[model samples]
Target: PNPYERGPDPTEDSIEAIRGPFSVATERVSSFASGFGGGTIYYPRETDEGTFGAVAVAPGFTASQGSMSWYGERVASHGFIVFTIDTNTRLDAPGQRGRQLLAALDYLVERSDRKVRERLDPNRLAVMGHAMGGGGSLEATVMRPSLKASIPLTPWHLDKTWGQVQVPTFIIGAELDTIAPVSTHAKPFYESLPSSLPKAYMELCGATHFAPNIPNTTIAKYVISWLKRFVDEDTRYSQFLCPNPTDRAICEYRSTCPY
Candidate 1:
């Protein structure tokens, strides 16, 4: 058995649904915490599956945790700990946001309450975010090489090259995004990563950078699959990714498949 696999087998409809198989509980973290502003932590309620992997998500520049809150229950219900966090300040840059994301995961591993700590697998942690926060996700991977996976949605970063990243990365780009166009931000970052690393990039048809802030089934499915594949080391979820999705929601797709 794959020791990291947490939930039941997956199907196209199962992942695309509004929720996953596991029940989730949430904890509200205080905003005064060190390293990063505190936010909500959504975790699986049952312990039958043992500890679940964890992820720390951040919102873009000038945005509050509310923008990232949608991912908490949605991803956690699938059998993982999801911490959607607020930055120390609304104007924090991508590099700072990156540090905050790591701090959030560190809190989950080192200082979270027993309910969340006991249910977490520290070594299986990952990172994610939206826009500049998405850039933070990429930053976190290079800052901490131990990370299992990263999903940056409509990411915006000043540094276009990321050849140093070793983590399995899945980047979602919005075709209509004027803030961080895919041609410059997402695609360049993808090409900069080592060609040998497991990676994928997708552009949403007619979607804008703000699309990720809203709950999207197309984004959720692949995000869930990427986390399951790398964080849980579960190959069962590979089917959804390796073949590359063909939904109308996707205007373009690229990947180092057979990963």
Candidate 2:
């Protein structure tokens, strides 16, 4: 037999065992229709050998699938079933714009309850977004308390007096982007995570607001590494992502990266 086999076989017992945890693809899904507009999604091929989880993604305003397709695929390659959607400016209804994320979550949950496939673990869902999408992710996370982890790339301020976000959140910020300065966006949320939950934050030096989604290899490495550390539960790669002394960017939480 192959040394690693596939993810896992989709059996009833296997499916039940995967109830609380699974794998996801890196595909984007959207619906620019009456329900909710569409964005992007990465769907991995179903494997009867292994399992997967779901990772929901959102894109910044004015950013098309073309711009985010690269980053979305990067997450998919990491074994997540990604679904990136477009936000309808300010639609508030569930699955309308920002709420569409919840709609997506519900869809996954329904599938899990129905035992549709083993590729989904309704319990191990993750929500992530970039720029304005990041802000949207932040908003949606509050509604989906079942999310295993929440990530917002270069999120901006959503309230006057930032409050504690009751979720396992990981905020990625940019040092040079003035549009969504870290001081106004991530800093407040970082401080609000309360000393209880697992709160994490990182700022990329010389990286702009769009660095996390750009096609550059350097930034992609950092983004993937961070996700793997948190969502993938991979600590071996934390050296490059955590507070390392050799590289100041990896250490300083409130200051600009010194690399």
Candidate 3:
């Protein structure tokens, strides 16, 4: 029955002029109690801000919340609050990705003090991740229907026995990535998503795994605009991504989407 108090340590400025490009908030995830922490949340400081949706980001193996700062900021900058939890400690947990994300969401939902649960549209939440994290992101959506969309970037090739998820999902990969090849990861998972569900795939020609997250700071605006459209309820912006012909979608994504 008590509000979670901030720890004794002082907070360092993550979004300050000399610090970096993102703003961060450390809230106590309440549904689950662990000393490791429910996790940390981050976003960008932009002039125009709107609170609509939230994104749960999972980073690569042995990666930290700071390692994912780039993409986390992008999603947050677009007005959609983004969060990433430190789940590297649980190496033996069954379906680690799914557990971490679900627990993290539970924490976030609690930290909102029931605000996000009641006011902000938690149903509009989305999940995105890289490498093993990418697979984890997809795995999370399968376990949690609250997620509206999913983006699995450079996932590891594995048995996608999770079956077709009903929600819209975007899977991205780099043709030149050696860590997770297109054939092993992206291609297999794309083929697995149910044909009935709204799905899209993007293959970056010369780009590597990191490029998709920050599609050039210049093009970030259009990327955020595109995300907010579907996640926030702007039907008009759907055409740019769903029907992107000649791969003219946001951030110059080279998509072969048939929808």
Candidate 4:
């Protein structure tokens, strides 16, 4: 049976069990040109299986690649190749951010000479970002619906329509985010998504727009599980995503299951 269609299995989706089998590592890449300002790529030291999927992450407006390093590292630790990137201009618009994100993905796929590249399953890719970068991630997915998944952390784009979003998306919102409040940004974006698409929303109570900046174990747990289920298509992580009393106390989650 298809796990996504049946919904996440509660027992397998444990927060404590989200971490994968691989050891994580990071490296800085400087070969990119144009739209890119260079950035870091996080990946597992080795995978007994074959190549892993790739993910590209961007920080919020005015934030640097370092701000998103934690997410990159955490996701990579879970066996995906993640890139934390810098925009050419600190205040680049969402469109530019989207382009830069794809550029970063291109850099990863072009590195066929490296071991990480050898183990990269270029066909499977995901985009994740925070604030404006988050908005950009949605835009990127719209432009490239081929992406396996998307995770936007307190994303902030102009009040707009995300109806074109067809990829499986997991949106994380901050309840206390004055910069991009859930009401105007996250919720609307989630609502604008087509009902035909598979989507989920997680609103963190009392959290700020920068909630993802610090190392929050809870966020890491869910983010890894989402990626594992949707991006990696690993059924082992599905059980951890179902209803949990602990998750409900801190987050309000809504989704189209078996999507």
Candidate 5:
């Protein structure tokens, strides 16, 4: 049985807030078995619960962990452990990023000495990224199916049937992105996945491939909600999955939602 099925609706007051009720802190990992790399692990300062889910996030091609810092901070603030990683090479392929993503996950689980790891559930983890790294997030699911979920932002990958992936996936696309247009990348990626798994496709209107890298109130709301619903398996965020009137104005959502 899927232990992560629906929970309680999120508090109306906290639904769109940048940070959740938890206080947040970060730690830098200097080196690990994951190649010549380092990352910032964002974790809750205090939680009555003993553990939380972890997320491994990778930046786009030619980008570093700093490029996705805003995303990392926002997600961490919402109560999950987030690792914003730097690939060994700036021009790594999607497959390479996928491998690194897995390695990053392993790194988090092994670092049990920290406060973050004390409250980190090694089994409940997810992958997220942008552009090539976004494509890599999906690739990571194929390479390591244990991932609980995948959230790809403006993913850049060739058109092909990604039928082996069984993990729930959330794909975010950019309407005005000439680089990785929705038609070629996001739509096909979403369609290629098997329908047995829950999935969602959302396109940001008038957005470019780089739009997600910038700070946006609306994007943060949906991303955190998705993570809360799936990664944390908290029912509180389920309501946000089915787009409300306000969300409809900024994005288009196509989903096979369990909620």
Candidate 6:
């Protein structure tokens, strides 16, 4: 019933598979971009499928687009525009990363090449990132409350509380993370968000902070679901989130479900 829905009906196996029904294509953004460093945009190639929602992803402190590149085509195949971006500099902090995330989205909607611009639905935009960039995802929604969704992977932020964020947010944590431990970073940030907001927190069992930088099936499926549910407003993916994931890869999962 949802016009926003893309691809076939959902299933555990379908979401977990390496690719979705939509074939993906890529375009490069120049580093000369105005507000944020340039990044690569991965998008669905099917014009008949309609304009797709897009996500602008940022890398962490001391990290380049290389660390977050896996998310581009991987997530794009699921029928969304995925951009894996570089920081203005390797040492940029969370707040700076957050600005860059918003700036990146602005660039996508306004300045990207015709191929990417033609496929992107600017109204249905989202933000995602790793480490401080993850924290930036949280920061971006506060800066732009209209954003459809937020996913912060193994995020790192100093000012713990985010009571002002109204975006539907999903925070992924690495249980054994020493750089940004779950107890200190992920948990406090999750608990800090207003309970009224649609949100979820998932911690990877026995995993380190760098876990998100690599490909993991459990993370991929849920991320796809979150983006679909919020950005695309597709309820078909809701079943995967409401039941609470029981995957061996996930040690802890918390959420406000049944949306």
Best by lDDT: 1
**lDDT on C-alpha atoms for all candidate structures:** 0.93, 0.57, 0.57, 0.79, 0.81, 0.91
lDDT tens string, model 2, 2-94? 322234332323222312123434333445433345555565555654555666666676764455666555556555667666555533322
Question: Over the full model, what C-alpha lDDT does candidate 2 score relative to the true structure?
Answer: 0.57
Task: Provide backbone clash counts, one per model.
Answer: 0, 34, 1, 7, 3, 0
Between prediction 1 and prediction 2, the one with superior lDDT is 1
Quote each prediction's TM-score. Answer: 0.99, 0.72, 0.72, 0.89, 0.91, 0.98
TM-score of 2: 0.72
Worst 10 residues of 6 by lDDT: 1-10
Worst 10 residues of 2 by lDDT: 12-21
Lowest summed lDDT over 10 consecutive residues: which window, candidate 5? 1-10
How high is the lDDT of residue 235 in model 2? 54
Predicted candidate 1 versus true structure: per-residue lDDT over 1-259, tens digit per residue: 9889887899999898778999889999999999999999999999987999999999998899899788988999998999999999999999999999999999999999899989988899999999999999999999999999999989999999999999999999999999999999999999899999999999999998899888899999899999999999999999999888899999999999988
Q: Write the per-residue lDDT of candidate 3 for residues 95-180, one digit (tens) a residue.
A: 57655766666555555554334434455677776777788877887788767777777776466554557756777767777877
Q: In model 5, what lDDT does residue 249 have?
A: 33
In the range 1-259, model 5's lDDT, one tens digit per residue, is 3344222346655656777767788888875645536788888777665578888999988899888998776777777889898898889988888888988888888854567678787889999999999989999999888788899999998745788898889888899999889999999998989888788888888888898888877677877887877787766677778653246536677888656
Question: By how many angstroms RMSD does model 2 differ from the true structure?
Answer: 8.2
Q: Can you list the residue pairs that collide in candidate 5?
A: 7-235, 8-236, 10-236
C-alpha RMSD for every candidate? 0.6, 8.2, 8.9, 3.5, 2.7, 0.8
Error of 6 at 245 (Å): 1.1
Q: Please give the distance, in angstroms, between residue 117's alpha carbon in candidate 1 and its true position after superposition.
A: 0.6
Shift in Å, residue 23, candidate 6: 1.0
Candidate 3 Cα deviation (angstroms), residue 23: 9.2
Segments of candidate 3 deviating more than 4 angstroms: 1-38, 43-51, 88-94, 113-119, 210-226, 245-259
